[PDB]
Amino acid sequence: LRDALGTVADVIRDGRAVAGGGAVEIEIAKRLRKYAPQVGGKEQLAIEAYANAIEGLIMILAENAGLDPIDKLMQLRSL
Amino acid sequence: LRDALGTVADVIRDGRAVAGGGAVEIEIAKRLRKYAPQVGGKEQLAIEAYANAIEGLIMILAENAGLDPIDKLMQLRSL
Ligand SMILES: Nc1ncnc2c1ncn2[C@@H]1O[C@H](COP(=O)(O)OP(=O)(O)O)[C@@H](O)[C@H]1O
Ligand SMILES: Nc1ncnc2c1ncn2[C@@H]1O[C@H](COP(=O)(O)OP(=O)(O)O)[C@@H](O)[C@H]1O
Numbered sequence A, B: 001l002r003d004a005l006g007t008v009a010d011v012i013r014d015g016r017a018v019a020g021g022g023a024v025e026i027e028i029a030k031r032l033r034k035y036a037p038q039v040g041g042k043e044q045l046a047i048e049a050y051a052n053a054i055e056g057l058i059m060i061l062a063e064n065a066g067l068d069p070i071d072k073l074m075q076l077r078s079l
Helices: A002-012 A023-039 A043-064 A069-078 B002-012 B023-039 B043-064 B069-078
Strands: none
Touching: A023 A043, A043 A069, A043 B069, A069 B043, B023 B043, B043 B069
16 A cells, blocks of 8 residues: 555656556667667667567566467567 | 689579679668568568578678678678
């Protein structure tokens, strides 16, 4: 209850809100793979890696729901 | 000389010709990364790998010319 109250208060003081289904994370992955070709130096291999690694989060979250993760990941990204 | 003659004959009987600077290979890599999202199944991870592996050829060829390969690869792909 005190944790829930604090959670709500942090919403109140943000005034804004986001989804949580890992979908915030996947959308970040889609902005990143469009920013990285503008930088183009050796640094590019680092940003492409970062996007792939944060896409690596929901791949774990699905595995705790017992789904076969790779197949659900590709289906999700396709949608 | 007999190898050169045979090389020419294979051109004559093709009637068509291509560059050789590894650039044929890099252009294939650019078609592939545009075909793969249409397939979309788990098979996608295999085609993206294939494109990355054939892009892995000229990375070796530059190393036999002593250049630092990664930097020349990124510069080439950017061009
Ligand atoms: N019921 C749920 N359905 C889907 N995603 C959830 C659910 N509960 C939590 N999440 C997601 O799990 C992550 C939060 O992990 P969690 O262990 O709950 O953190 P905390 O322990 O700090 O609450 C976020 O991606 C959140 O949106
Ligand atoms: N002088 C060169 N400059 C650039 N690329 C070259 C040159 N000579 C060969 N290549 C490339 O090297 C590859 C051919 O490798 P090579 O060892 O010559 O095969 P082979 O021994 O059968 O002739 C192709 O990509 C070809 O275009």
